[PDB]
Design a protein around this motif. Structure first.
Motif, PDB file in Angstrom:
ATOM      1  N   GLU A  48      16.783 -33.288  26.955  1.00 33.97           N
ATOM      2  CA  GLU A  48      15.829 -32.377  26.342  1.00 33.97           C
ATOM      3  C   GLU A  48      16.095 -30.964  26.834  1.00 33.97           C
ATOM      4  N   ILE A  49      15.956 -29.993  25.937  1.00 37.77           N
ATOM      5  CA  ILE A  49      16.163 -28.588  26.256  1.00 37.77           C
ATOM      6  C   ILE A  49      14.878 -27.834  25.953  1.00 37.77           C
ATOM      7  N   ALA A  50      14.376 -27.104  26.946  1.00 43.36           N
ATOM      8  CA  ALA A  50      13.218 -26.228  26.786  1.00 43.36           C
ATOM      9  C   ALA A  50      13.665 -24.809  27.099  1.00 43.36           C
ATOM     10  N   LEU A  51      13.719 -23.962  26.080  1.00 40.22           N
ATOM     11  CA  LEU A  51      14.248 -22.614  26.223  1.00 40.22           C
ATOM     12  C   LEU A  51      13.102 -21.614  26.291  1.00 40.22           C
ATOM     13  N   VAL A  52      13.147 -20.731  27.288  1.00 45.56           N
ATOM     14  CA  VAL A  52      12.162 -19.671  27.431  1.00 45.56           C
ATOM     15  C   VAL A  52      12.887 -18.354  27.676  1.00 45.56           C
ATOM     16  N   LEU A  53      12.288 -17.283  27.164  1.00 43.68           N
ATOM     17  CA  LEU A  53      12.854 -15.947  27.229  1.00 43.68           C
ATOM     18  C   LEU A  53      11.902 -15.065  28.017  1.00 43.68           C
ATOM     19  N   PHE A  54      12.416 -14.367  29.022  1.00 44.56           N
ATOM     20  CA  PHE A  54      11.601 -13.450  29.805  1.00 44.56           C
ATOM     21  C   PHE A  54      12.083 -12.023  29.593  1.00 44.56           C
ATOM     22  N   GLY A  55      11.136 -11.128  29.320  1.00 46.39           N
ATOM     23  CA  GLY A  55      11.451  -9.755  28.993  1.00 46.39           C
ATOM     24  C   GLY A  55      11.478  -9.527  27.497  1.00 46.39           C
ATOM     25  N   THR A  56      10.572 -10.180  26.777  1.00 52.51           N
ATOM     26  CA  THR A  56      10.554 -10.165  25.324  1.00 52.51           C
ATOM     27  C   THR A  56       9.661  -9.039  24.809  1.00 52.51           C
ATOM     28  N   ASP A  57       9.537  -8.950  23.484  1.00 56.14           N
ATOM     29  CA  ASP A  57       8.572  -8.033  22.888  1.00 56.14           C
ATOM     30  C   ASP A  57       7.148  -8.481  23.185  1.00 56.14           C
ATOM     31  N   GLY A  58       6.781  -9.667  22.705  1.00 55.53           N
ATOM     32  CA  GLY A  58       5.478 -10.237  22.963  1.00 55.53           C
ATOM     33  C   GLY A  58       5.514 -11.233  24.101  1.00 55.53           C
ATOM     34  N   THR A  59       4.373 -11.886  24.310  1.00 49.33           N
ATOM     35  CA  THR A  59       4.228 -12.917  25.335  1.00 49.33           C
ATOM     36  C   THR A  59       3.582 -14.138  24.691  1.00 49.33           C
ATOM     37  N   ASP A  60       4.407 -15.007  24.118  1.00 44.77           N
ATOM     38  CA  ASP A  60       3.930 -16.274  23.565  1.00 44.77           C
ATOM     39  C   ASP A  60       3.968 -17.375  24.618  1.00 44.77           C
ATOM     40  N   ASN A  61       3.383 -17.092  25.761  1.00 46.11           N
ATOM     41  CA  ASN A  61       3.370 -17.961  26.922  1.00 46.11           C
ATOM     42  C   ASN A  61       2.158 -18.887  26.892  1.00 46.11           C
ATOM     43  N   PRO A  62       2.313 -20.125  27.366  1.00 43.63           N
ATOM     44  CA  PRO A  62       1.140 -21.001  27.504  1.00 43.63           C
ATOM     45  C   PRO A  62       0.085 -20.428  28.426  1.00 43.63           C
ATOM     46  N   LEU A  63       0.491 -19.720  29.475  1.00 42.69           N
ATOM     47  CA  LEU A  63      -0.438 -19.054  30.372  1.00 42.69           C
ATOM     48  C   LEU A  63      -0.035 -17.595  30.519  1.00 42.69           C
ATOM     49  N   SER A  64      -1.007 -16.702  30.344  1.00 43.90           N
ATOM     50  CA  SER A  64      -0.780 -15.269  30.533  1.00 43.90           C
ATOM     51  C   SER A  64      -2.075 -14.683  31.097  1.00 43.90           C
ATOM     52  N   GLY A  65      -2.139 -14.590  32.420  1.00 46.88           N
ATOM     53  CA  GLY A  65      -3.332 -14.106  33.082  1.00 46.88           C
ATOM     54  C   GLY A  65      -3.294 -12.621  33.370  1.00 46.88           C
ATOM     55  N   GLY A  66      -3.939 -11.831  32.518  1.00 45.70           N
ATOM     56  CA  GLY A  66      -3.957 -10.396  32.727  1.00 45.70           C
ATOM     57  C   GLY A  66      -2.573  -9.790  32.605  1.00 45.70           C
ATOM     58  N   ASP A  67      -2.261  -8.881  33.531  1.00 43.00           N
ATOM     59  CA  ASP A  67      -0.994  -8.160  33.469  1.00 43.00           C
ATOM     60  C   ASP A  67       0.197  -9.091  33.668  1.00 43.00           C
ATOM     61  N   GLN A  68       0.109 -10.004  34.632  1.00 44.70           N
ATOM     62  CA  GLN A  68       1.232 -10.882  34.918  1.00 44.70           C
ATOM     63  C   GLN A  68       1.433 -11.872  33.774  1.00 44.70           C
ATOM     64  N   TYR A  69       2.566 -12.573  33.825  1.00 44.71           N
ATOM     65  CA  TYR A  69       2.976 -13.489  32.766  1.00 44.71           C
ATOM     66  C   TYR A  69       3.044 -12.750  31.430  1.00 44.71           C
ATOM     67  N   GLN A  70       3.947 -11.776  31.373  1.00 44.71           N
ATOM     68  CA  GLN A  70       4.058 -10.888  30.228  1.00 44.71           C
ATOM     69  C   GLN A  70       5.506 -10.814  29.772  1.00 44.71           C
ATOM     70  N   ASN A  71       5.687 -10.571  28.472  1.00 49.40           N
ATOM     71  CA  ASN A  71       7.009 -10.475  27.853  1.00 49.40           C
ATOM     72  C   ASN A  71       7.801 -11.769  28.007  1.00 49.40           C
ATOM     73  N   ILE A  72       7.099 -12.893  28.119  1.00 45.29           N
ATOM     74  CA  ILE A  72       7.721 -14.202  28.260  1.00 45.29           C
ATOM     75  C   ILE A  72       7.261 -15.080  27.106  1.00 45.29           C
ATOM     76  N   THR A  73       8.222 -15.662  26.399  1.00 44.16           N
ATOM     77  CA  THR A  73       7.952 -16.535  25.266  1.00 44.16           C
ATOM     78  C   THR A  73       8.642 -17.867  25.496  1.00 44.16           C
ATOM     79  N   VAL A  74       7.858 -18.943  25.512  1.00 40.68           N
ATOM     80  CA  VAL A  74       8.402 -20.298  25.585  1.00 40.68           C
ATOM     81  C   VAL A  74       8.793 -20.658  24.156  1.00 40.68           C
ATOM     82  N   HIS A  75      10.045 -20.359  23.805  1.00 44.88           N
ATOM     83  CA  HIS A  75      10.477 -20.570  22.430  1.00 44.88           C
ATOM     84  C   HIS A  75      10.486 -22.048  22.070  1.00 44.88           C
ATOM     85  N   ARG A  76      10.967 -22.898  22.971  1.00 43.00           N
ATOM     86  CA  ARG A  76      11.067 -24.322  22.699  1.00 43.00           C
ATOM     87  C   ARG A  76      10.565 -25.124  23.886  1.00 43.00           C
ATOM     88  N   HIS A  77       9.876 -26.220  23.588  1.00 40.14           N
ATOM     89  CA  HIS A  77       9.460 -27.173  24.604  1.00 40.14           C
ATOM     90  C   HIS A  77      10.600 -28.161  24.845  1.00 40.14           C
TER      91      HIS A  77
END
Lengths: 211, 490
Positions: A48-77
């Motif tokens: 199984e491959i789970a691909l995530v991108l850090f430093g993105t335009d948006g933050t499609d993250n499962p968890l994004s608490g305030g400022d931290q966890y930003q510009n990170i998108t978990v593209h694939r589980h």
DNA sequence: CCCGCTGCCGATTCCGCTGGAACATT
DNA sequence: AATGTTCCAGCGGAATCGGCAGCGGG
């Protein structure tokens, strides 16, 4: 039996910087990851491959608490890598110029591993990092994430661009940086990742770092 | 010449002295010769089944040959060996075969020893093939076929030299009249016993010599030396079966084809493609496309540089080595560069590293040209030729990674008793002689089936261990090893 | 335009090796 | 399912040899 790899690869502006005259680290990392997923897909192995991108335009993250966890998108589980997961990398020209962090991508990787280690037996957990090490490192928590790595019994691998210390083009069994490819921010980033990995399991981790 | 088939005429003596066993009940020398020829047929029918063999009898009473000399009987004009001819000679084995021989042609007469040599010459000269060696084995025990005539002796010597100049080499193995070589014939002039090997030396083998590849070793821009890539060791394997028709025992002439696009109708090689179904989706491309995606370089060797023989660790083996040897006829002067490289690399103990591509459309594969030095002596021990050895190099995934999570040493005193055992069992490996049990058994069963004699022999497996021999030759120290620190403990 | 040799070069046959695809087994 | 064996298919070396060109004479 099975295996699960959670790739995290940078798309930040500095890592996707303009070509100094050889290549761009974004393109090199994209080539490496596309080769990996290519081997996985055409080998037809139960991984199984789970691909995530850090430093993105948006933050499609499962968890994004305030400022931290930003510009990170978990593209694939963690799911079977298909031609969609490969054309995705083939259709990912956008870097999304918001360089935030990389350790956030690491903790997100552990989060998604624990979120998807349900109903599927797994003997191995691997997480890959591709980073220029050019953003401001986060020290919100380091000891606890190391303890999480120890208890979850996972091994990571970090890849960094030509900057390690002839016209080096892609690979020629020779030099990595042409004349001087590192900055002080990248210098301290390499230092901190080296000491973290050494504290994790020592010299073997220093061996598991490749341009 | 490459396509030069070897020839051999068997000239045995049937005059009087081989139908009596010198007051013994061991074996009449005529029977000994027939045994030898049987052995040679059964050997070359699976070793060299393209060579020509002939059996000719002289000193007989009735005659048969293309010239019609008296007392010369050509049992078989020279041709490839077969089961029919082995059986035809087998009907003369033993004393029953001896009397059969007596009655079909009949021994006892005044042979000439100059008409028979002429008949052998005619046999050699009547075949339409390129012959590499003409040789005649003379099976006789008599010393003086000229006991009462000197003109006959002079004619025999004349015709012997007359054979020799045309490249026909006569060699004589003398059936020992008293059973031991003390009868020293003075005919060192005519000829150019060593016979037990000829009874059984080579159970099974093959013959050839060929390039297997004619390439260009290019010094990376234009310095190209032509060179042959020979195969020193090959792993021969049993011949392929032939589909044979039950009712008549005839080759059946298979023919394969593809058709029926749900209709019934022949498909030409042009209306089909090649596909691979990965995951859910099917990738399609045509035959030339699927032949051309494995194409990197042109055939030949290209130097990647030089590495000393030390750092290529000799357990990276996956493909039996080949043998580079210079070939000048394609590009002239190659042998000079080859010799220079050989000498310099030997003196520096450095092997070349090349990118090998044997055929036109095949991925390149990394090889090491390890120099080897020709060794030879006064006895002329030509057992390795000068040149290079292509060791094939693994890439990254031809290697495999193993558990490796096991590390436990033994105390430095079991090593002594294992040393005792190994020096006890120390033996020189071999020069030859470990012949394949499967292959040898196949040959023996096939011999039995073709000659349908009694039932097939059992090849003695040289590969099996002499278990009782080891047990007795170690004696009382293996049990001492078994229970020194580690009893079963139940 | 013929006519004729005569180099010689292409293709066949025969082997043999390798590779790929299919088999059968624990 | 992992592998070894068998089988089929394809490429090349080597020898042979015939005729295809081109080149002189008629």
């Amino acid at each position: 039996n099975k295996a699960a790899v959670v790739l995290c690869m940078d798309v930040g502006f500095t890592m996707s910087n303009s070509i100094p005259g050889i290549e761009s680290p974004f393109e090199q990392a994209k080539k490496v990851i596309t080769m990996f997923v290519q081997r996985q897909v055409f080998a037809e192995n139960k991984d199984e491959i789970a691909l995530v991108l850090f430093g993105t335009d948006g933050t499609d993250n499962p968890l994004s608490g305030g400022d931290q966890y930003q510009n990170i998108t978990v593209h694939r589980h963690l799911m079977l890598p298909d031609f969609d997961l490969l054309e995705d990398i083939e259709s990912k020209i956008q870097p999304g110029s918001q360089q935030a962090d990389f350790l956030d991508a690491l903790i997100v990787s552990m989060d998604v591993i624990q979120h998807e280690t349900i109903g599927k037996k797994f003997e191995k957990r691997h997480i890959e990092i591709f980073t220029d090490l050019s953003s401001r490192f986060s020290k919100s928590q380091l000891d606890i994430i190391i303890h999480s790595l120890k208890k979850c019994d996972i091994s990571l691998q970090f890849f960094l661009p030509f900057s390690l210390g002839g016209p080096f083009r892609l690979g020629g069994h020779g030099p990595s940086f042409p004349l001087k490819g590192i900055t002080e921010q990248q210098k301290e980033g390499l230092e901190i990742v080296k000491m973290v990995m050494i504290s994790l399991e020592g010299e073997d981790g220093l061996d598991e770092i490749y341009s | 010449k490459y396509s030069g088939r070897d020839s051999l005429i068997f000239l045995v003596d049937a005059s009087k002295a081989m139908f009596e066993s010198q007051s013994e009940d061991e074996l009449t020398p005529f029977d000994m010769s027939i045994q030898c020829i049987q052995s040679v047929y059964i050997s070359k029918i699976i070793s060299s089944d393209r060579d020509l063999l002939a059996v000719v009898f002289y000193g007989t009473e009735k005659d048969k040959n293309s010239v019609n000399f008296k007392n010369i009987y050509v049992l078989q004009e020279l041709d490839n060996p077969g089961a029919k001819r082995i059986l035809e000679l087998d009907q003369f084995k033993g004393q029953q075969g001896q009397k059969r021989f007596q009655d079909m042609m009949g021994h006892g007469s005044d042979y000439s020893l100059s008409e028979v040599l002429w008949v052998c010459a005619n046999l050699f000269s009547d075949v339409q093939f390129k012959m590499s060696h003409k040789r005649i084995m003379l099976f006789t025990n008599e010393d003086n076929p000229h006991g009462n005539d000197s003109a006959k002796a002079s004619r025999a010597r004349t015709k012997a030299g007359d054979l020799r100049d045309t490249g026909i080499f006569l060699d004589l193995m003398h059936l020992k009249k008293p059973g031991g070589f003390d009868i020293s014939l003075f005919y060192r002039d005519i000829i150019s016993s060593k016979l037990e090997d000829l009874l059984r030396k080579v159970r099974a083998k093959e013959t050839r010599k060929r390039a297997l590849s004619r390439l260009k070793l290019k010094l990376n821009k234009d310095i190209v030396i032509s060179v042959g890539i020979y195969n020193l060791v090959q792993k021969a394997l049993k011949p392929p079966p032939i589909k044979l028709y039950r009712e008549t025992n005839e080759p059946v002439k298979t023919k394969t084809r593809t058709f029926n696009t749900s209709t019934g109708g022949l498909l030409l090689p042009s209306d089909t493609k090649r596909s691979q179904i990965y995951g859910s989706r099917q990738i399609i491309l045509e035959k030339e496309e699927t032949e051309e995606l494995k194409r990197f370089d042109d055939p030949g060797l290209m130097l990647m540089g030089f590495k000393p023989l030390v750092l290529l660790k000799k357990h990276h083996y996956l493909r039996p080595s080949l043998f580079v040897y210079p070939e000048e006829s394609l590009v002239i002067g190659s042998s000079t560069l080859f010799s220079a490289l050989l000498i310099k690399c030997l003196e520096k103990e450095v092997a070349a590293l090349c990118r090998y591509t044997p055929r036109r459309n095949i991925p390149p594969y990394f090889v090491a040209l390890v120099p080897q030095e020709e060794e030879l002596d006064d006895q002329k021990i030509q057992v390795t030729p000068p040149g290079f050895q292509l060791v094939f190099l693994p890439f990254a995934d031809d290697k495999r990674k193993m558990p490796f999570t096991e590390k436990i040493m033994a105390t430095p005193e079991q090593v002594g008793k294992m040393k005792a055992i190994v020096e006890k069992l120390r033996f020189t490996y071999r020069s030859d002689s470990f012949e394949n049990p499967v292959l040898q058994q196949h040959f023996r069963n096939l011999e039995a089936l073709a000659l349908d004699l009694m039932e097939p022999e059992q090849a003695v497996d040289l590969t099996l261990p002499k278990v009782e021999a080891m047990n007795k030759r170690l004696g009382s120290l293996v049990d001492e090893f078994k229970e020194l620190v580690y009893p079963p403990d139940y």
